[PDB]
Design brief:
The complex is a heterodimer of chains A (283) and B (178). Chain A has 283 residues and is α+β, with helices and mostly antiparallel strands. Helices cover 30% and strands 29% of the residues of chain A. Classes of the chains: A alpha+beta (283), B mainly alpha (178). Chain A: A motif (Nuclear localization signal) lies at residues 9-24.
């Protein structure tokens, strides 16, 4: 059921506002005798929510009101001079960002907030949608105020059943993300026929629009099937197009379920990680 | 080596709770851990009610152990309900778990009744059989209430307040793919 242009724009804008809500900066290169006041004076045009100045290291950890203030402070003071010291002003390299994948595609942004909110205060929380249809890609990102919150979330969500799905959780480097890199190049195929042993017929079926660069069945050290397959396509547009025609397609008397993987890793890394997660949980 | 005679209805009720609880990991879920002990205790009860050496004292203690594990399931379910933002789930959870202490008190009383009969020889077969039936009905009610609590606590896990206090972990012990 196709979404009206107003709903598509509403979803994509919410995801864009959420993705851009990075308001924590890190200042390095401060003079040895710097004071808290000097840092407050430097950033007097902005509203400081938090400011810790480490006098022993020449660094400051500052939380500004929003992402717009953070970018403005960065542009204004990155590589500027403070009493002849060159300053580095960059987004804080926090480690509290998770990708929650294999979500039901019907799961709403509100339901995704309800799922990830009990573990702590959220800095960023958004589903990733198709730019063309506005439909959810079945994965989202949650960034907490604290790393301990994200660890607690990953522990409770990794291998959690939600509808006809088992969620996957992957720690993501906030620094490695861009709006383009939010769109996954990997697909996950499950609902294979029982005792499926024809990988070639699977890669061909999944080659109907675009040819995958990677296509392997998941299997343990003893070679036995783990229940799924991982595929990789050259681009995000190619993976999205392949997923659209292949999802629900009949193969060997079974209607395949084709989903998106967490957007970061290549096929080989994704396949090993998904096998590892399931094995750890079963044993 | 020697397959002990059991009460099949109390064993089937125990096995049904065990099936339900082993769908989940016990790590970060003390309800699941307690539910798993209740099932193995209820499986011991299916052997105890058939009589034998020292079964009087054993049956009384087994119902006390089941009641202690029940108390824990109820304590934990009330901690989950206190963090739940959905009125319907919160109400179901509190309703479905407040009956558990009542059923376990009746199980301790019904265990003592049957235990006192195992220790005697002047009790009629009809009386002995109905004392077992009462334990059967109680055990079925208790295993059902614990399955219901486990289902409502799990349904609540996605309806918890922001930055909550107490939460339970719901991670499957069954294959992840379809």
């Amino acid at each position: 059921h196709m979404l009206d242009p107003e709903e598509i724009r509403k979803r994509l804008e919410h995801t864009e506002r959420q993705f851009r809500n990075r308001r924590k900066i890190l200042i390095r290169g401060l003079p040895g005798d710097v004071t808290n006041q000097e840092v407050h004076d430097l950033l007097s045009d902005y509203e400081l929510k938090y400011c810790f100045v480490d006098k022993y290291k020449g660094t400051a950890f500052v939380t500004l009101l929003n992402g717009e203030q953070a970018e403005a402070a960065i542009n204004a003071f990155h590589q500027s001079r403070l009493r002849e010291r060159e300053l580095s002003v960059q987004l804080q390299p926090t480690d509290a960002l998770l990708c929650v994948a294999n979500l039901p595609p019907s799961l709403t942004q509100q339901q995704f907030e309800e799922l990830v909110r009990p573990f702590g205060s959220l800095e960023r929380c958004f589903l990733v949608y198709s730019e063309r249809t506005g439909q959810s890609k079945g994965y989202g990102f949650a960034e907490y105020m604290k790393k301990d919150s994200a660890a607690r979330a990953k522990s409770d969500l990794l291998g959690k059943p939600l509808g006809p799905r088992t969620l996957y959780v992957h720690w993501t480097d906030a620094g490695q993300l861009t709006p383009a890199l939010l769109h996954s190049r990997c697909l996950c195929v499950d609902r294979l026929p029982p005792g499926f042993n024809d990988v070639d017929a699977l890669c061909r079926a999944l080659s109907a629009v675009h040819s995958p660069t990677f296509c392997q069945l998941a299997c343990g050290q003893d070679g036995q099937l783990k229940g799924f397959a991982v595929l990789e396509y050259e681009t995000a547009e190619m993976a999205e197009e392949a997923q659209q025609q292949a999802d629900g397609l009949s193969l060997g008397g079974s209607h395949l379920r084709v989903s998106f993987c967490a957007p970061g890793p290549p096929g080989r890394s994704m396949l090993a990680a998904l096998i590892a997660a399931q094995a750890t949980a079963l044993n | 080596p020697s397959n002990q005679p059991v009460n099949q209805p109390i064993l089937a009720a125990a096995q049904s709770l065990h099936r339900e609880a082993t769908k989940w990991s016990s790590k970060g879920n003390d309800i699941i851990a307690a539910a798993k002990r209740m099932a193995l205790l209820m499986a011991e009860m299916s052997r105890l009610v058939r009589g034998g050496s020292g079964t009087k004292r054993a049956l009384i203690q087994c119902a006390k152990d089941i009641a202690k594990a029940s108390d824990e399931v109820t304590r934990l379910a009330k901690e989950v309900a206190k963090q739940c933002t959905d009125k319907r789930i919160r109400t179901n959870l509190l309703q479905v778990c407040e009956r558990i202490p009542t059923i376990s008190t009746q199980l301790k009383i019904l265990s003592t009744v049957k235990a006192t009969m195992l220790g005697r020889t002047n009790i009629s077969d009809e009386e002995s059989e109905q004392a077992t039936e009462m334990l059967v009905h109680n055990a079925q009610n208790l295993m059902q209430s614990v399955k219901e609590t486990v289902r409502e606590a799990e349904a609540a896990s996605i309806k918890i307040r922001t930055d909550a206090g107490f939460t339970l972990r719901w991670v499957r012990k069954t294959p992840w793919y379809q």
